[PDB]
């Protein structure tokens, strides 16, 4: 089954992602195919998939930027029916906004069926153009037609996935304790993490004994990413991935605070030194505490 | 012995505190007697006492606001010698900036002797006027003269004192773990804590599931107090007291994040709800984790 999470949804036939045109929150804003840049935040192209309780493999798809939902215009089963952003809620019973998402015959891509109409999300004519129509179209679950096949590129981790990434790290102290704060996290490219740091004012902060030392830099970076999350996205039900760790050196006679993020593959953590903005696989400390 | 810490130093004879005039960092800025408001931050009247290793009961006194040190002008033993703020360092060997501080004959107030001159800090003529001269003056350790007697009103806690205040609280979960980040903390009046909250932008922040929920408010309040500390004070070697706690309700089925501060007497904690700015003796959660 598709898991709850944030997805970048990429056509199987051509390199176009499902894009809410101009990120607009207006009802009836067209959802279109659009090119994308890997290892960036594709601002109009991220979708929060919320499973519907007691409806198998069925989800709402909320655009992270607009907070509006993928909507099949008037629930029509006609081929060519507009797919648009529309106001809604994460657990609506409105079938226009409910989507059954299951693996295609290829077994890696998915098809996206409207729960009401039983028609499929279709990049019309397989057009790779920026702004190409996406429509509800006649189809079947088993056919090869790449107009209706979609790679769900997972951009979020669950708290359980973050927990696993930390646990396989070789710089974790024996006494380590982790404190989880949220459920589902958008993983930032290091380019975006770095931009939040650059914009935070930390690069221009002086290290000062106790009054503005490593713990202040690390907590300030975590607050800066929290603020960025709320300010950047209108959807609810997810957090931005940014951890704080406390660590102790090998000699057990010095401690430090720092941040951490996750690799592109979501399998490992990477340490972030918030005084200088460096990324490190080894920061010179074993983590005894983390909150994220 | 006087312990390392931040003090408000109040004359025993008249309600004048030791004040660095206008908070000025200029060398030779006069230190004067000045009236004060209890349960406020008295901005020019806070002194960081740093013990000198291997010199008994001897300290530098750094003004928290200016970062400059109490200095006996040219180390003169003449009665009437100016006491001024002067550039220095926490562990100087300059005797002009070294002060032996021991209990007076009354046993609650202290006298302040210059280590070089062996003369005493003296509110000249016991004058209660705002801007009254403070001078080095002839004296003895045992005499009653209130011109030379000073109450050291302790405005900071050690991490060990904070740890004790948390431990005597009745809302601590059995699984509680605390993570200490600094050594010595300025305790804020609730009026100042509240002002930092009002100025943080949190009062005008909306609660949003995961993306800006209780953990975001609590970490944002802690960052706001950290920033305020560094921006407000030029001295180093202390932190501002502002904790974050995670707690679980009695039923064990809901958790929350919040802040905490300390009572005026430094003996107990008080919970701070960063969404609404309320102070509470019972926030409805037992703390399982704290960092401060």
């Amino acid at each position: 089954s598709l898991r709850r999470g944030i997805y970048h949804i990429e056509n199987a036939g051509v390199p176009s992602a499902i894009d809410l045109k101009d990120g607009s929150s207006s009802d009836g804003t067209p959802i279109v195919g659009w090119q994308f840049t890997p290892d960036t935040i594709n601002w109009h192209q991220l979708w929060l998939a919320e499973p519907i309780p007691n409806v198998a493999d069925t989800f709402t798809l909320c655009n992270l930027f607009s907070g509006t939902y993928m909507d099949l215009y008037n629930g029509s089963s006609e081929a060519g029916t507009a797919v648009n952003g529309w106001q809604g809620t994460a657990f609506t019973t409105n079938p226009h906004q409910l989507w059954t998402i299951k693996k295609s015959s290829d077994g890696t891509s998915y098809k996206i069926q409207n729960y009401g109409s039983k028609t499929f999300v279709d990049l019309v004519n397989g057009d790779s153009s920026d702004g190409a129509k996406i429509a509800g179209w006649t189809g079947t679950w088993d056919e090869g037609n790449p107009h209706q096949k979609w790679y769900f590129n997972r951009m979020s981790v669950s708290s359980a996935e973050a927990q696993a990434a930390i646990a396989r790290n070789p710089h974790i102290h024996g006494t380590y304790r982790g404190y989880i704060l949220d459920g589902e996290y958008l993983v930032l490219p290091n380019a975006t993490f770095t931009q939040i740091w650059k914009d935070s004012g930390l690069p221009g902060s002086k290290w000062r004994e106790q009054i503005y030392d490593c713990d202040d830099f690390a907590i300030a970076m975590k607050a800066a990413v929290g603020k960025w999350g709320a300010d950047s996205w209108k959807a609810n039900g997810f957090a931005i991935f940014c951890g704080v760790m406390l660590g102790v050196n090998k000699a057990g006679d010095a401690a430090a605070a720092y941040n951490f993020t996750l690799t592109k593959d979501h399998a490992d953590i990477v340490f972030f030194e918030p005084q200088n903005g460096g990324y490190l696989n080894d920061i010179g400390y074993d983590s005894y505490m983390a909150f994220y | 012995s006087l312990r390392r810490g931040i003090y408000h130093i109040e004359n025993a004879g008249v309600p004048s505190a030791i004040d660095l005039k206008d908070g000025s960092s200029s060398d030779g800025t006069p230190i004067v007697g000045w009236q004060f408001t209890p349960d406020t931050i008295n901005w020019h009247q806070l002194w960081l006492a740093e013990p000198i290793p291997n010199v008994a009961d001897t300290f530098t006194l750094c003004n928290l606001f200016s970062g400059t040190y109490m200095d006996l002008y040219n180390g003169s033993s003449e009665a009437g010698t100016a006491v001024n703020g002067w550039q220095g360092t926490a562990f100087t060997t300059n005797p002009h900036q070294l002060w032996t501080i021991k209990k007076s004959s009354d046993g609650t107030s202290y006298k302040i002797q210059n280590y070089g001159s062996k003369t005493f800090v003296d509110l000249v003529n016991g004058d209660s006027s705002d801007g009254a001269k403070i001078a080095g003056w002839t004296g003895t350790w045992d005499e009653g003269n209130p011109h030379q007697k000073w109450y050291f009103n302790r405005m900071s806690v050690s991490s060990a004192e904070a740890q004790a205040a948390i431990a005597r609280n009745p809302h601590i979960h059995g699984t509680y773990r605390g993570y200490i980040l600094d050594g010595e903390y300025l305790v804020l009046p609730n009026a100042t804590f509240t002002q930092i909250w009002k100025d943080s932008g949190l009062p005008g922040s909306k609660w949003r599931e995961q993306i800006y929920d209780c953990d975001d408010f609590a970490i944002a309040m802690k960052a706001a107090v950290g920033k305020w500390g560094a921006d407000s004070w030029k001295a180093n070697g202390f932190a501002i007291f502002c904790g974050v706690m995670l707690g679980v309700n009695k039923a064990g089925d809901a958790a929350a994040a919040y802040n905490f501060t300390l009572t005026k007497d430094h003996a107990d904690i008080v919970f701070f709800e960063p969404q609404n700015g309320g102070y509470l003796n019972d926030i409805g959660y037992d703390s399982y984790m704290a960092f401060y």
Binding site: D213, D215, A255, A256 | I180, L181
Partner: peptide
Amino acid sequence: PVPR
């Protein structure tokens, strides 16, 4: 120790 204490994070410095």
